[PDB]
Ligand binder design. Sequence first.
Ligand SMILES: Cc1ncc(C[n+]2c([C@H](O)CF)sc(CCOP(=O)(O)OP(=O)(O)O)c2C)c(N)n1
Ligand SMILES: Cc1ncc(C[n+]2csc(CCOP(=O)(O)OP(=O)(O)O)c2C)c(N)n1
Ligand SMILES: Cc1ncc(C[n+]2csc(CCOP(=O)(O)OP(=O)(O)O)c2C)c(N)n1
Ligand SMILES: [Mg+2]
Ligand SMILES: [Mg+2]
Ligand SMILES: [Mg+2]
Ligand SMILES: [Mg+2]
Ligand SMILES: [Mg+2]
Ligand SMILES: [Mg+2]
Lengths: 541, 557, 557
Amino acid sequence: PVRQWAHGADLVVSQLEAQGVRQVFGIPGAKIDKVFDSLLDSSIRIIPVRHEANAAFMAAAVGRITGKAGVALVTSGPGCSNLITGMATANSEGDPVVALGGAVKRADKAKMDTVAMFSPVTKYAIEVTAPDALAEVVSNAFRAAEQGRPGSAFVSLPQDVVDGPVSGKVLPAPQMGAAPDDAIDQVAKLIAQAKNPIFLLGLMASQPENSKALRRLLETSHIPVTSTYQAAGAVNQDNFSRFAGRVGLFNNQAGDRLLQLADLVICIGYSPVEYEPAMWNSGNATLVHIDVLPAYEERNYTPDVELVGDIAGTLNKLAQNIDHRLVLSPQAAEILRDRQHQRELLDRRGAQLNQFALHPLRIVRAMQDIVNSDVTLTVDMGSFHIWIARYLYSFRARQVMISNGQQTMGVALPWAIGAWLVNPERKVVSVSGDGGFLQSSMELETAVRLKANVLHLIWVDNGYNMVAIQEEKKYQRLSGVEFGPMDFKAYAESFGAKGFAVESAEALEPTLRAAMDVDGPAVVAIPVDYRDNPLLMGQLH
Amino acid sequence: VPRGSHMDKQYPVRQWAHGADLVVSQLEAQGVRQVFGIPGAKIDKVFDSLLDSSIRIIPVRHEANAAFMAAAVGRITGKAGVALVTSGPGCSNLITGMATANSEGDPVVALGGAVKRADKAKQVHQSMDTVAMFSPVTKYAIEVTAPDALAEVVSNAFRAAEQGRPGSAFVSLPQDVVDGPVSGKVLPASGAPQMGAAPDDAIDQVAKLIAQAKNPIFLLGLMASQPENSKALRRLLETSHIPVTSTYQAAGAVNQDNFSRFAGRVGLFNNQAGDRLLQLADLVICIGYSPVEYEPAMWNSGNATLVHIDVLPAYEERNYTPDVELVGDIAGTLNKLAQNIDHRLVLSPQAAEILRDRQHQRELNQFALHPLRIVRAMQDIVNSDVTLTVDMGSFHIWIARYLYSFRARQVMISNGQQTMGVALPWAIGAWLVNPERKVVSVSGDGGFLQSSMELETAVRLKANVLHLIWVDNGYNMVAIQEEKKYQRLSGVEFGPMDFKAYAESFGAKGFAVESAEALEPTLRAAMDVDGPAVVAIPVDYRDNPLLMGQLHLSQIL
Amino acid sequence: VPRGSHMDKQYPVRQWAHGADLVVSQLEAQGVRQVFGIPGAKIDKVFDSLLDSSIRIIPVRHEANAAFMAAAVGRITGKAGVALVTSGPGCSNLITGMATANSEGDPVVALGGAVKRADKAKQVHQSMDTVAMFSPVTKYAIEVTAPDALAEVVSNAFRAAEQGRPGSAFVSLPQDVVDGPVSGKVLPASGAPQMGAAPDDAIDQVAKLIAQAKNPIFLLGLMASQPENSKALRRLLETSHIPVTSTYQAAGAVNQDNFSRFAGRVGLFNNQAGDRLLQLADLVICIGYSPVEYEPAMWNSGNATLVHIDVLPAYEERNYTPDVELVGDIAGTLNKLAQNIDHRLVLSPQAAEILRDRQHQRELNQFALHPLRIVRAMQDIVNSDVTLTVDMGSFHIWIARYLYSFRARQVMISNGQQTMGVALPWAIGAWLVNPERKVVSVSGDGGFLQSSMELETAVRLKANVLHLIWVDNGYNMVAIQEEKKYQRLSGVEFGPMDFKAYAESFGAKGFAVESAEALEPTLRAAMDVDGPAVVAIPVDYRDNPLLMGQLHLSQIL
Ligand SMILES: Cc1ncc(C[n+]2c([C@H](O)CF)sc(CCOP(=O)(O)OP(=O)(O)O)c2C)c(N)n1
Ligand SMILES: Cc1ncc(C[n+]2csc(CCOP(=O)(O)OP(=O)(O)O)c2C)c(N)n1
Ligand SMILES: Cc1ncc(C[n+]2csc(CCOP(=O)(O)OP(=O)(O)O)c2C)c(N)n1
Ligand SMILES: [Mg+2]
Ligand SMILES: [Mg+2]
Ligand SMILES: [Mg+2]
Ligand SMILES: [Mg+2]
Ligand SMILES: [Mg+2]
Ligand SMILES: [Mg+2]
């Protein structure tokens, strides 16, 4: 219904409601405060954060889970530029985010060029200069964020546009069918002829709408699977016997050996940016691309067969047309048997008593004890990230947020807060180093204020270890990587959250269990002995 | 055997002596048959490497026209036409042509020379960031900074130009990259994706809307004209019997000879059959259409249900917010829709009356010639075997107004950016694709002189092109609007020329119509010339104000 | 009485009916005497408002040449030439011309139409973000989005074009802004700033360097040619007696007639007097020079102390990192330096020998004509009362090589971007500034046909321009380098034309040289024509490889 609106902000809020938005994250200011004011009259919850960067991280968590964009709302100038890192992180990981940023009155733009600053790190960036287009622009931002391979979108809203009246109407919010039957038959024939097929899963294969169809295709075909880190949660060792690990980080993965051995590779939901094809595509295998978009071709990614459409309907049709389960070639069996032994060796069953400060593998064990299938895990960036990534095969979480191609620090706690708001009846564990922690730890006030049931673990080394380990390897000396200690227990408690500090190994497991039982935000500082990190870092590409 | 194989004898991995050789080998894999351009030092190794190829070098006389010629090739073949130019002004002379191709959806790849990578940042070259200059007028614009990426970038440029909604693509080639060695292979070209149709539930939703509509109409856009959609479109029209109108970009997607309920074109006039059926419609089904082709505020009354069928979701703007989107392979969607239509449309009395009115067309000795006399004489020489290309100016409006009585099956007229000078270069490009057929190009005297340097190219090629000039000694399309708004003229009058002698100085055949009676015999004589000819036709534009009141005037730039 | 007064009867605050009227009033305040361009609907109110002004409307036949003509006006008058075009292709047709003006430092303001503000974002217009397209090739590019800013933006565009190091500036004018009402006043134009000279301690530092140098030389750039610096430059040269060489952008900053130690120009050759003195120098003092004019890697051996004198600090690049910078008003700095020079330079034997060698110049009946024969005949008709303009191609190198024996005081040849087509439009612009003087323009057949449409403009204006074509039926400058590198040619040959008849079809006088003996009498006859004339001169380019070995070959685009 074309309505007359007293304020553009009111039409904005009504469009947000049509988009299923449940919360907005951000920080108000004069240029944008009419949108904040209009939200008082809506069902949408206003969540003030303490740094705009984290509004973008929280929004990304909401977008990743729900498939509908999370929303950040900030004022002009620094409110917008404080989003840029967060928006680039969302765009890189495929998380649907819409950021609405205030701007000066249109008449004053003559006397920050936010659109130019956001264009390199968004799918869509635009400023509303014609009030008659307000709802169209917002709708287009959600469509850009949510459709295809999702990503981030930025809309600049001049103060006079959202304050003044407008004429317009709200616009209501699967958009593709399955790949054609002839293409399904073509792929099914290739599968029937292949001796060493393998599935390479990318981002879109991990979307919730695809989980049942993916499982049916794997159950029917029993074809080995390897996954990019964007798709780290699509399949795991505990739910598929022919899982070959995540590829992209470690130089000794079954998935890579199977990709090298393959005579047929079927990439599902995958874009080359997720794992450089020069690393895995020999060119000797027939290459099938299945995604919501055409292939992003490059010299090491020129598919022989290209299917575009609804992934679930496509995989369901494909499963319906596979004649027999794969019988592994002897080479493929050995690769997977090799990986079983690799996993046993990584478990370190017999070298199981430890020393202090805590050995990383001891911390991983204690984390895997408290993270079960009802718990979400978020992972920051740092040396601990490599440890957790190495042991993803033995984590059994509801969901793991870990993929981080920009390698942005500070993501874990805001990701966890956003994920908790989606399913607040559940617990979230976030883990970071001490460097990443302090880049977003201001949101502990937000977490206390929300009573968010988040447990944050800090691997404490008083430095930037992941950088130090590389400096030591290249130069045998450290520079800019050491800093001072903090009383993290007292730090957490000054916010009104529960604090814990692990003063002994034996206290590790009971402390984490005690922290998990807190109904609300808790922080646990865990001193770590990274001496053995060179051992793990040598397992990297 | 796989496309990416490093042991394919048809696409071997080689240590190429010059990156230019790999570029040329890649062009061959893209099906390129000729390149249009002007050489210079930075790009001359690509010109040289083309000597060892089956690809023909066609030197033009101004780079803008290389882009125009390439667009004609792209539109007709569906594979990108290619322009090749040197650094600096060789590149910047392409920008209007690349914008025109991108706006019309014509696949064009421009390869432009650049200074050596080490010299890029020197102040001498600060006013020629060509990627920044081409980004606003292309789908794809990139510079090759790594020799290993040479084939990938050229391949990706063709893929951007040709796939999705086609458009123009620019590649900057630094001199040291094309002159120096490279290791790599050609990337074999891929076809269109095997794309799902729209979802079945959405298609049923639209079938039900069709069953309930009293005045449905199909609005065809650019992608409806692609050959992969031809059979499916024909079958849907035969099964549904729903009327159809086409934007100018939809080209010959449908013709009156095959479908009795074709209402003609939309995009310029406000009062023709297609416009009246769109105004009457309770359901508009757009196929392969984007608002770039025809501003929706001009045709969408907001009273009809709106369906969007295309390979891409809609970009919602004012007056184009579809109620249902059918996203996917157009042919697959149309085939599924045709299966779910239970009966042929019984036209409303008003709709039947609109189409009957279009069927009626009753088919002037003043000198200078009346526009209608010129149109009628052109319709005599332009038969189904002849391609027609049309420039921009008042004559374009006359020709568009009576396009229904031209029987050329190949017409290049669509020109949303309203670029002058396009007609002769479009005609040369079209002739090169089908040299066994005559092309007739038509312009005003303003547009003629913006690209007439290519008459030398036409003579050198022996192109069978007849160019007609409507001569008024001014920029009439601008004058009409100035007279209407201000009742006085500014900047629209210039002096006369002897266009017969002008054409002959190129070695083309020249003609000038000096009386009304001489029009038709002169056109026949110029048509019988086997090679380039130019005919000047003095025109009396007195009646033009009456035609422009039938136009969407706000669209004129 | 103050410049910003709201009660100035000479610049009243008004409720203007149309923003276009305020634009035109602002142009009058900037001293604009004519505008070059092509109208269209979006911009036609500015054309209309010019009817009520003393400013002359000059319609051109291709927008590129409006930019070229404007550059000639800017260079000669020091106040920006003005191009006026419509939206879309009217704007994008300017880009090469704006880049050429910016690179040469010619002040040019282009006013381009645009769609109404409300329509800017519609998809039809997505390929014409003109500010983004012009930003890489201008000093200043902006769109007026607030009517209250109309005069400010036009004023600021002239200030960007004219002040500092001059260049080109673009203003986008939305149709609704120029058609609708505005409240405001004209902004009176300001002069150059009253700028301090370089600091006294730095000037003494350079005076001491002069006192110690055995082979000092002045290298003059663009800003040395500005009239405000003329007396100061002359006085410094007379006091110091230091030799001087000029980039091509320095124009007529110094001539051999006034200063006996002028070594000629640098920028193309590697072996002329200026190049040898720069190679010999222990001290190089650059005045008004920027590396954009002449790549420092070509001339700076790194063995001399380097002084930078300009209104702006240096931008340090490879081979241009000055040891002392004298930043400030050039005239003020040169006047202070002259006061601190204690004696005239005694030239070194080598330096004196270099200059003696330049003084020697001993001042061929084959057909086609030898280039040297053509140069010598041109030197007969080009006297101090005649302006000479020169296009790009091999003939440019010949003319540059013997520029020392042309006695025209006004020569437009500098062309770092190497843009073809410049000469005829430059000549028309120059003639409009001083219509009492003859202009001779010279091009090849390639460059001729890129701008020859302006022969109609020349005939319509009755411009006293003689255009000479060196005719080889190819793109020779490219062919020479292809032959040298590859020993074969590609894309450089085209067909012949009857240029006499070509010119006559415009109503210009045409001539064709058919024998060596006929060259000089034909040139004299074409020179005696009072109005536009064209002379075709067949040229034998066999010897060109010998000339190009004297060039910095890497500079050719
Ligand atoms: C925003 C940003 N800046 C720089 C960096 C650089 N950096 C990392 C990159 O991934 C590697 F270049 S990780 C990291 C943090 C290390 O500090 P902690 O969090 O304490 O973890 P620890 O390894 O000690 O366990 C850094 C600094 C960053 N990621 N992100
Ligand atoms: C490159 C360019 N500049 C300006 C315009 C604006 N314009 C549109 S039609 C036209 C007149 C064309 O004159 P002509 O070719 O002689 O056609 P006529 O209307 O006189 O028949 C102009 C100048 C344009 N469309 N393209
Ligand atoms: C717009 C443009 N395109 C290409 C070039 C490269 N180029 C430099 S000189 C030249 C040849 C010019 O031919 P012509 O005008 O006939 O002069 P000639 O050398 O034959 O005497 C070319 C194509 C250029 N400088 N400018
Ligand atoms: Mg972007
Ligand atoms: Mg740390
Ligand atoms: Mg672009
Ligand atoms: Mg005309
Ligand atoms: Mg700029
Ligand atoms: Mg030539």
